[PDB]
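[Structure tokenization] protein backbone as discrete codes
[Encoding] learned vocabulary of local backbone shapes
[Protein] chain in single-letter code, fold in tokens
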Amino acid sequence: ASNTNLIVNYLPQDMTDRELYALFRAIGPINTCRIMRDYKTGYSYGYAFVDFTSEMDSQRAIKVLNGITVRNKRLKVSYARPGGESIK
């Protein structure tokens, strides 16, 4: 199949995958972009999901985008493998 969903970290807990699209939409052909945060109070901790559905050009953007700049911090980008790859 195809699709290597990634995870963007270093989020302000208020940013939006839209502004993120202004970056990724130019780096890789993302197929979907969501943000992870408490679904009850909305308490975000910095971390979302951005898939490139490229599994190739995306990986390159993963070594680069990893630690970019959000006008104040530096986003993060991994191949969706937080906490020891889905725990491990």
Q: What stands out?
A: Strands lie at 6-8, 32-35, 48-51. The chain has one domain: 1-88. The helical segments are 17-27, 57-65, 82-86. The longest strand covers residues 32-35.
